[PDB]
Amino acid sequence: EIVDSFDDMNLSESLLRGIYAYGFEKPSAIQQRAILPCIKGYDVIAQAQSGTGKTATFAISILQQIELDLKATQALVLAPTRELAQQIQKVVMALGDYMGASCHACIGGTNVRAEVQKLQMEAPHIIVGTPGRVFDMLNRRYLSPKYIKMFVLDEADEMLSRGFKDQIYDIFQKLNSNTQVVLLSATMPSDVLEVTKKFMRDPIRILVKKEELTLEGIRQFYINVEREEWKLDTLCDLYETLTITQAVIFINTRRKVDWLTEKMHARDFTVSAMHGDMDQKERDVIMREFRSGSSRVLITTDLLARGIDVQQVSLVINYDLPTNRENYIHRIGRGGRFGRKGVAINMVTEEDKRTLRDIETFYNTSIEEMPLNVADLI
């Protein structure tokens, strides 16, 4: 039930070569618990702290199950955003590099004719996608579910939310009745867990109490801003005060991302911005330029709150507080990846500091006032 070495998981030699080439050495806590029941075919609900390696948990399990000589799609992974799907596809391709497993991204904002021409010719072993384009390709029969034996929902509690649950159900109805289902997330509320009883067969539950989700390496602070009209000057002050690797600044609406980005540019501050109403060509460039370090400060919506992994991010600023409790955990988790040291700063008006106290109580955490004029907080 606990297997502390990749060497003891009965993985193929090519899969192990790919794991070690990517730079892993020992499995994370969640990997030691969840890879083997997934390989064995059990329905699994896998929860673990942000940044602990849930991607490779399902990636390694899918790869080990692939029948390489079967030229058909055998596994389908869904993610809530295009950026997250693209990121998962790269991890899966890297881990399976020595196996020649094929992994295809089925995501919106890409040219449909080009995808259709690829899928008319080849049946990728592994599909990583977003729900809209996946449902589209299933309806037009360019993706076949005939041999899909593994269905993975990353960020599963978001995928089973009001906005996505019906999309996931529509896709699920296309799949064979015997398909294995694997769910992963940092957050798994009891109401989402009840929805899983409707479609998962007596799953293995690896769950983490909410009071244990917060990372020790992510120091959480708040700043009394009192008035919303004062947030902009506070941000500008934090730009000049704080030591700057890379930072993500979260905003609750696309409209306000656009507003804030213009305000910062007018004041000669260098920032980039991304949200879901931008052309996908622009999203791809912005994401690429943040990954490379060309841009160090990104203003974004919850488009980038879940799953995105930029190791150099050490600072998250909640310029708007998240209304949703679960979202708070995902946001601050963009800093402090795989045990790195991070800071999260919450900007709080009078009306916000209630919402803040409820977050503190729910997660049994403590959020401290940010020191004055301290450049290096943690």
Place this chain on the structure above:
RNA sequence: AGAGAGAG
């Protein structure tokens, strides 16, 4: 009715 989530 936030954020995302095919297409045109």
